Amino acid sequence: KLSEEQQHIIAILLDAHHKTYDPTYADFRDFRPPVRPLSMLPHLADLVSYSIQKVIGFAKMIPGFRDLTSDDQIVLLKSSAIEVIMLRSNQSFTMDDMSWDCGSQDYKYDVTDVSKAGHTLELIEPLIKFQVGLKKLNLHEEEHVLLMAICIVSPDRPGVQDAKLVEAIQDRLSNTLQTYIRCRHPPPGSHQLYAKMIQKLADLRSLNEEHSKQYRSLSFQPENSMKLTPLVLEVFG
C-alpha cells in the first residue's frame, strides 16, 4: 500500500524537479559559447556549474535533508554531484544518435563534444552505456526523481559523520520507491525494476571514480583550471 506519507514524498520531489529543471533550456544564453585544444571546455564547464546549482536546489527539498548537519549536507552533495548530473542529463539524452539534445543543434552534445572538454573514452564509453541502459528503463517521472534523491542521500559516502541518520532518510525514499513500483508500475516494465535501478547507482559509483581521476588530471594544468568556474572548483576540488 502507498501510504499518505509516501504519496506526499513523491508530490514534493516531482515539484522540486519541476522547479529545478527547465526543459526549455532558456538559461543556456548565459553560458560561454560552444566551439566545435579543449574547445568545448568553457561551455561544458558553464553547463556543469549551472547544473550543480540546480542539483542543490533539488536536494534542499528532499524530505529530511535539512535535518542533517551542514557538514553532512556538504559531504553528500560534493560526493553525489557528478552522479546526479549524469542522471538528470538522461532526460535530454536521445538514443537516435547517442547525444544529449538540449533543444538546439548548437546545444546538442555527442561523444566528440565531451572529448573536446578534456575527457577520454575511459569515461565516455561507460557513460554512453549507462545513458542507454537508463533510457531503456523508461522510468516514470516519479521513479526518476526518487532515484536522484536516493543517490544524494547515501550513507556510505566518505566523510559522512551521522551515517545512521542519512541511512534513515534514504530508507524512507527506498521504501517509497519499492512500494511505488509495485502499486503503480504495470508489468512487464516493472520486472526487477528496483534491482535494475539500484544497479544504476552502482554504475554511477564507477563513473564518479573515473570522472574525478580525469578531473584531477585536467585540472592539474592551470591553463585548463582557468576555464573552469569557481563553484566547479569548490565542488570537484
Binding site: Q53, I56, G57, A59, K60, S70, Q73, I74, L77, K78, P230, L231, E234, V235
Partner: peptide
C-alpha cells in the same frame, strides 16, 4: 572551506 556550497544550502 566551502563558502559557495554553504551559501547555496542555507
Amino acid at each position: 572551506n566551502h563558502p559557495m556550497l554553504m551559501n547555496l544550502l542555507k
